[PDB]
Each structure stands twice: as C-alpha cells, then as structure tokens.
C-alpha cells in the first residue's frame, strides 16, 4: 500500500546522478512523508505542482563578452544550433519557447562600472551569466564577476577555442587567466570550449556544473536545450525524461489503442534525440541507402512489433523488481525512451557500426 508506494518512490530517484534529479531531496522526502501519512490527495497536489513548475520553467542565460565567431558559436550551442552594440539582444531557442539566450556586449566596450553595467543589462532577469573570451580575461572581467557574486548570482568563465575539422588545454588556461585569482580571491574555474566539438575540453564539465547549480525544476529544460551530439548530452536527456514520466505515472495512480495515443509523444521524444524523419533521412543519404532500409538497423521503429503483450508482461515484472505497479502508458514511454537514446548513441558512430541492429537493446526488454 502507501508504505510500499513511498518506498518505491524513494528507490526510483536513488538511481540518478545528483545533478540530473528534476526534484530536490527536500521535495522527495516531502512526497514520501505525505504518502506514508496516507495524505494521498496532498501528495498528488505536490506532484502536480512540481510538474507544473518543470513544464513552464523559463530559462534566461546572459552571455557577456567581446564580439566574435567563438561567442556567436557558443550562443548557438546553447540554442541547440550547430552552425558597436550597446544593447542586449535576445536569441530565442528554436525548439523550446521558454528558453532565451541573451547576447550582452562586453563590459570593456561600454563606459559602465560593474554595478551600472548590470542594471543597464537588467541583471535580475537571468538565471546565470557566462563571461566569455576568445583571448585572455582582463581585470574588467574579474570585477564584473565579483559584482555578480555580490548580487547573490552565479557566473561561469568560458574561453572559446578555434579548432579545425592535455597540453593545449593547460597552456591556454595559463595564457587566458593567470591573473583571475588575483582580483577575485576564491579560485573560479575556467571552462575551455571548442568552437567545433562540444565533446572536447571542458564542455562536458560545464553542462554538469550548470545542471548542478540550477534549481532542480529547471534542470529538465536545460538538459533538453543542447543538441544530442554526445553520449553525455543524450544520457542527461534520457534520465530527465525518464524521471518526468515516472512523476506523471505517480500522479495518475488495448495496447494498440494506448500506443496510438502516445504517437505524438513518441514523435516529440524522437525530436529530442535527433531521430526525427528529417534527421534520419539525412543520415541515410550519407550512407547511400533507403531511409526505410536505414531504419531496419534501428530498434525504435520495430519496437512494438513472441507476442507483444507477453513481452510487456515480462518487461513490467523486471521494472517492478526493486511491489508497486503503474499504468501501461508509463512502461511504454520508459521503454521507448531507453530504445531511442540507445539508437541515438549508436548513430554517433553510424557508418563504422554497420561493420541486425547497430544499437544496444534497452535494459530488461530483450532478455
């Protein structure tokens, strides 16, 4: 009953990295206590509210520094795009409407003190600041960082690196910031980021830190904002989506019918992982084959083809083992999310992997 529901709620969220949890440790213990006290309406009301804040979370990121190719590329990276100003300029995310990346002019190109620069750029609107440079950070930049901390807000230093398509990283950091820990006195990190490959240098560490520092309810929309170009960014999306459908199942209490209603949800999920038709049709042409003949080696198109009801029956018993059960819609969504994430990971090395499926199976499904 309620006690087993509560203990199954607790065990589920222990399987996820700290920085990817879409609800706080406080809200977890809260929902547990209410369920244990059998205040079931109160618990559902809390879960509903949590889901409300996750789905409507705005994300406003201020990117401040000198103009140039590296800065524009990083702003596009935060919009999920792979391509003498004195005003800030908004750049809305093309796929998430609640997300806006702001281009702020470098403080050195204005006549503003740190405090007046921040009020001119309406600092209270943002979730955090990225202070970005292509060369070396100046005393200017360190005093702006100091002024942001004194507002009670977060900043991160990003140095962009021109690339073509270890020792380089250590040398660039000695060049770009050997005077930062003088002006600031706590030691701030610098994140080196490649202008071509988000897998390189410090960008994986940056996504992890930004997630860790954000409020729990904003982690979902941030994890979705980045393009599915590395195993790390795919898995942050996978784990965040899996938590969300579990919360939906917790608040809620003919497989072909259920599948047909999830059809729009399944297409949303495909777009998150880069498996929309257009993305797949493009990979198929680079491989010189029918897109229909391409998808034969992906697991997600034939996932719901031993009869399906028996496979699902056995799937549900594995997911239940470390009993609490949920609606069939929860298990189908969870299964589809693991299958699509695995297919997107395999396509990161598409052509070398054809040498019947190129992806790993979703756990507990085909065994």
Author numbering: -1 to 81, 94 to 175, 190 to 277, 287 to 338, 343 to 359, 367 to 399, 404 to 415
Quote the study's own text.
The p47 immunity-related GTPase (IRG) Irgb6 plays a pioneering role in host defense against Toxoplasma gondii infection. Irgb6 is recruited to the parasitophorous vacuole membrane (PVM) formed by T. gondii and disrupts it. The overall architectures of Irgb6 are similar to previously solved Irga6 or Irgb10 structures. They consist of an N-terminal helical domain (N-domain; amino acids 1–55; αA-αC) (purple in Fig 1A), a GTPase domain (G-domain; amino acids 56–239; H1-H5, αd, S1-S6) (green in Fig 1A), and a C-terminal helical domain (C-domain; amino acids 255–415; αF-αL) (pink in Fig 1A). The membrane-binding interface of Irgb6 assumes a unique conformation, composed of N- and C-terminal helical regions forming a phospholipid binding site.
